[PDB]
């Protein structure tokens, strides 16, 4: 297949392309949601010891489909529990409170909440890649 081997088209497509994920604060997320009404995804993980978490981060959160979907439709908040901790005391207290608040036990776990703190849906690690993961969240949050 010469066509498959060929590439690097002169004509540029999709000017929008894709952008990296923009992390927001828990306090900031709600502020925006109160105004924008968009759901908040809290990412609970172990950056330095949970391999499955790395996989979720590397394969779904950092995936192009996830980036595009979330950049447009969601507010993302990072909540990490590393072995080597260097987060400010205030951040750690808030993070622990949040972990308990949403009854988070297993990681990786992504929980969707509204600006009033109501849970719309929750998901963990699920094979299939970024495209498939976003389809699932859409159905869960009733986005259409």
Swiss-Prot record:
UniProt keyword terms in alphabetical order: Disulfide bond, Oxidoreductase, Periplasm, Redox-active center, Signal
S-S pairs: 50-53
Tree of life domain: Bacteria
Location of this chain's protein in the cell: Periplasm
Domain Thioredoxin: 10-144
UniProt binding sites for substrate: 51-52
Pfam families: Thioredoxin_2
UniProt GO cellular component terms: periplasmic space
EC number: 1.8.-.-
GO MF terms held by the record: oxidoreductase activity
Keyword presence, Nucleus: no
NCBIfam families on file: DisulfRedDsbH
Subunit structure, interactors included: Monomer.
Function: Catalyzes the reduction of disulfide bonds. May function in reducing intermolecular disulfides between proteins and small molecules in the periplasm, or keeping a specific subset of periplasmic proteins reduced, or maintaining the periplasm of Chlamydia in a generally reducing state. Seems to be unable to oxidize thiols into disulfides and does not display disulfide bond isomerase activity.
Record protein name field: Disulfide bond reductase DsbH
Originating organism: Chlamydia pneumoniae
